[PDB]
Amino acid sequence: RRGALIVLEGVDRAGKSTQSRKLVEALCAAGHRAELLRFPERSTEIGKLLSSYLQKKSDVEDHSVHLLFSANRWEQVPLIKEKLSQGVTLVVDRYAFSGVAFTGAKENFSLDWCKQPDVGLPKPDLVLFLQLQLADAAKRGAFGHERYENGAFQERALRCFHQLMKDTTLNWKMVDASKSIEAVHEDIRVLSEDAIATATEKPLGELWK
Numbered sequence: 001r002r003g004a005l006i007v008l009e010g011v012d013r014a015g016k017s018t019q020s021r022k023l024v025e026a027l028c029a030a031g032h033r034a035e036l037l038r039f040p041e042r043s044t045e046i047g048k049l050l051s052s053y054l055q056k057k058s059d060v061e062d063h064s065v066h067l068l069f070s071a072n073r074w075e076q077v078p079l080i081k082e083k084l085s086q087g088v089t090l091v092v093d094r095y096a097f098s099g100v101a102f103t104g105a106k107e108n109f110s111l112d113w114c115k116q117p118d119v120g121l122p123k124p125d126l127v128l129f130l131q132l133q134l135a136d137a138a139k140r141g142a143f144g145h146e147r148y149e150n151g152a153f154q155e156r157a158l159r160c161f162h163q164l165m166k167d168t169t170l171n172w173k174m175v176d177a178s179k180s181i182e183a184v185h186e187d188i189r190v191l192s193e194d195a196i197a198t199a200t201e202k203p204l205g206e207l208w209k
């Protein structure tokens with residue numbers, strides 16, 4: 001009985017990391033085997049190159065960095081498939097959708113070109129998108145020093161996310177991330193329990209193919 005692959009995507013400061021941590025904790029407390037992943041995974045050799053880029057400690061050509069972000073997912077595919085096959089549900093803080101939306105926000109990058117490197121990855125059984133109005137986000141801190149942490153760029157990435165949500169091959173669920181941490185958590189947790197039950201029924205799919 002395989003585990004489910006659950007991805008959290010969402011606007012800046014919408015609560016992806018908070019909700020991913022809370023979801024794994026709740027699932028494990030309810031008797032499931034669940035583990036947390038995040039992308040980029042900065043611990044690998046590729047992940048270190050990505051972390052330096054995001055911190056502005058290095059500059060990387062736009063196409064090359066897009067491909068590093070995708071390679072950083074592929075290097076974890078053997079682990080992802082092993083865990084799901086062993087019955088472990090994986091909760092993932094960002095995935096290929098962020099990969100496409102962030103590079104796709106740059107000039108002269110088509111969504112098609114951006115998707116291709118990730119074609120074939122393990123397909124999420126559930127893609128949560130944490131929606132939040134900017135007035136409500138603003139109250140969640142201030143733009144930091146990392147790359148991409150600016151309004152105009154975030155807005156272009158959001159438009160790309162909306163283009164990806166048109167894709168009916170995926171199980172997208174919108175989450176109102178403007179509520180309390182606990183209320184958002186309960187909405188996510190219930191959606192996740194449902195997905196876990198059904199994932200044991202169909203084989204793990206392949207993304208965008």
Ligand SMILES: Nc1ncnc2c1ncn2[C@@H]1O[C@H](COP(=O)(O)OP(=O)(O)NP(=O)(O)O)[C@@H](O)[C@H]1O
Binds near residue numbers: 012013018184
């Ligand atoms: N529902 C919520 N209400 C209020 N504050 C929240 C909520 N969820 C998260 N926060 C806070 O807002 C900040 C950002 O939350 P976090 O879950 O880290 O965002 P994130 O979605 O991972 N952001 P990023 O990774 O930068 O795109 C943290 O200090 C959280 O404690």
Ligand SMILES: Cc1cn([C@H]2C[C@H](F)[C@@H](COP(=O)(O)O)O2)c(=O)[nH]c1=O
Binds near residue numbers: 098099100103
């Ligand atoms: C997974 C992924 C994330 N992002 C961006 C979005 C964001 F600025 C950053 C990750 O920030 P944290 O790792 O601190 O969550 O990297 C991309 O541009 N491409 C990707 O493939």
Ligand SMILES: [Mg+2]
Binds near residue numbers: 016017018
């Ligand atoms: Mg985060």
Ligand SMILES: [Mg+2]
């Ligand atoms: Mg093609």
